Design a protein around this ligand. Structure first.
Ligand SMILES: O=C1N=NC(=O)c2cc(OCc3cccc(Br)c3)ccc21
Lengths: 198, 195
């Protein structure tokens, strides 16, 4: 069920595809980034074609679309990371067990930002030895969310008398969400890698 | 693609089905337990019919069968748990974020029911009832674990992203397996028993 606009991968399971400025695909990601990161400049944007991560993510999306009934369950969010983590994330996606404690913790999970400006902080997108910073653009199954708390290892129950029926994600603020935390594998697909510099 | 031996769920996606004693499915699961736990009393065995967990597990199985270029990635293993964790596991399966973790920070599965039957794992409830899962685990290609692992090690440190599927206490004669990812383990049966 691989998307028809992906490059042919020749029975291979992984490929990074360099995008061309002037194409709508490149320009919409550039605009989404520059909305809050006008001071930085983009070196390049790569489409991540990971067949296995895509399959698992799409199975979780279809399950959450069934479970939630007519919710927009998916948001396009940002995740800054260090150069050392980029090969693992490209192949294996986002592992909560590898996640750094956030300066404002709303739970022990993987953090995704609404604003590129947040992920552009040196604390998340650490400049490598050549001054390159790295930010993923990520399909995240935010589903139905509530304000998190520092102690969470899973999203909280919607109802305390039904502890197993969980929120899909948590946020910093349900009125004005600026970040989302997810606690399960295959709940985020890294779709694009932005390489950028000051 | 819901298995043959599952019974009708009336268009629902989750059911716990009590097995009939004396029929093949019950007898098969009873014998796997009684191989090392003949001194315990089985109160009941339930088949876990969780369509979402099953689907995510079968996708991983298909992926691991392609990656390893053969089948034989699956083992039937035991997991003891406290009564309060049973509803979570039935619905969401096994969560590494939730005892000793000497071979890594993953979910632990025993080759022998007798290991899972220890009170430290299958903690007796108020009434003395103990709980153990029979689990389909995608052990795949495994190596020896060690303390502090958050994922299995690489097969070759010249390709750090190509990983073993699981780790064990002992590669020649394993008695436990640790997996580090959601949906590498399907809880298939729950055994309620006493000492
Ligand atoms: O069935 C289980 N249910 N919950 C567990 O945490 C568990 C853990 C487990 O190995 C833990 C361990 C660690 C180091 C040395 C030795 Br020896 C054993 C085996 C079975 C189980």
């Amino acid at each position: 069920n691989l998307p028809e606009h992906w490059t042919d991968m020749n029975h291979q399971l992984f490929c990074m595809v360099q995008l061309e400025p002037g194409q709508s695909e490149y320009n919409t990601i550039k605009d989404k980034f520059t909305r809050t990161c006008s001071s930085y400049a983009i070196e390049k944007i790569e489409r991540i074609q990971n067949a296995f991560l895509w399959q698992s993510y799409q199975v979780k999306k279809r399950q959450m679309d069934i479970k939630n009934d007519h919710k927009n369950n998916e948001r396009l969010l940002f995740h800054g990371t260090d150069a050392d983590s980029v090969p693992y994330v490209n192949q294996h996606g986002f592992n909560r067990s590898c996640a750094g404690k956030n300066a404002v913790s709303y739970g022990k999970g993987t953090y995704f930002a609404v604003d590129a400006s947040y992920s552009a902080k040196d604390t998340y997108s650490k400049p490598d030895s050549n001054g390159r910073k790295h930010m993923y653009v990520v399909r995240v199954l935010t589903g139905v969310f509530t304000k998190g708390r520092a102690g969470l290892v899973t999203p909280p129950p919607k109802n305390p008398h039904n502890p197993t029926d969980l929120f899909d994600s948590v946020t910093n603020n349900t009125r004005s969400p600026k970040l989302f935390v997810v606690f399960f594998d295959n709940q985020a697909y890294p779709e694009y890698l932005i390489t950028f510099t000051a």
